[PDB]
Design a protein around this ligand. Sequence first.
Ligand SMILES: [Mg+2]
Ligand SMILES: [Mg+2]
Length: 339
Amino acid sequence: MASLSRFRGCLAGALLGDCVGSFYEAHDTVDLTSVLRHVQSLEPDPEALYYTDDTAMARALVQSLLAKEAFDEVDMAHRFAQEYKKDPDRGYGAGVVTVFKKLLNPKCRDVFEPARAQFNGKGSYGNGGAMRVAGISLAYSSVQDVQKFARLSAQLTHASSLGYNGAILQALAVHLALQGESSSEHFLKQLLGHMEDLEGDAQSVLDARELGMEERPYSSRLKKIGELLDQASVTREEVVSELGNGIAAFESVPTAIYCFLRCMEPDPEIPSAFNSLQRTLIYSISLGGDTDTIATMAGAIAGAYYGMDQVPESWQQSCEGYEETDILAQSLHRVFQKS
Ligand SMILES: [Mg+2]
Ligand SMILES: [Mg+2]
């Protein structure tokens, strides 16, 4: 499979995760049968599903990378802010809105200061850095640039290492996804090596200990994925208890990744006519909690790995702006991949 296909699959899967997972975000628990009914209603026979903050930001991040042919924090920050100002009602978290509103100040002149000031200088560790980061791994091909620019992109709104390290991790998973066919063993191992190295930094260790998490929390969770995957049958309750399904990056980014890995194999609960990308998005949503973001992150990874061949037209064409999202992928491929 060729890499425009992976680029297109990445962004479309992210878009599907948002658009479809967003239906379940206010739900207590999620009924699997209801998710199955809903995705089946996308097919037939004989109204778009709206995207939210997660795709709005992912797009504005891509657009910045395209306009500058590189990461440029002043441009990206301004695009984030203007996209909010244009369409403020996409469903942004309250915390991120305070940052945008500071960014829209004429007297703001350090774009990283607003984010840094949040939670009394601790910064946010929510998943909003990670929800939008996929573009970084489509623009930057070296693992080093991916880490660097995923951190700085996240830092525009999420100044906590617990936040930006999750963005890094999600950027690395999509990066490794772009290399295609792997064992889940090999895939996790590579992710672990990177996060064990990142979480040894003194800032990451202070931030974890201050939160009272004792440290290397992304590394700890990547090891738990390891044991979940090698357990015969693991229930949703057990996944959510070990990994999380919440808004914090550490409760969502690893979960998105177990969903990707687990769903590489069939599941008798999910009709066997659904392909692996499909299964991933269904399974991701069925865990509840922060369904729009977990599924958009899991869709990003799945899409990069499986490509547009597993993105059905009926699903894709149900989503608001699926046409702009294909253009975004084609432009990124041309601007960054073709050379
Ligand atoms: Mg959302
Ligand atoms: Mg969300």
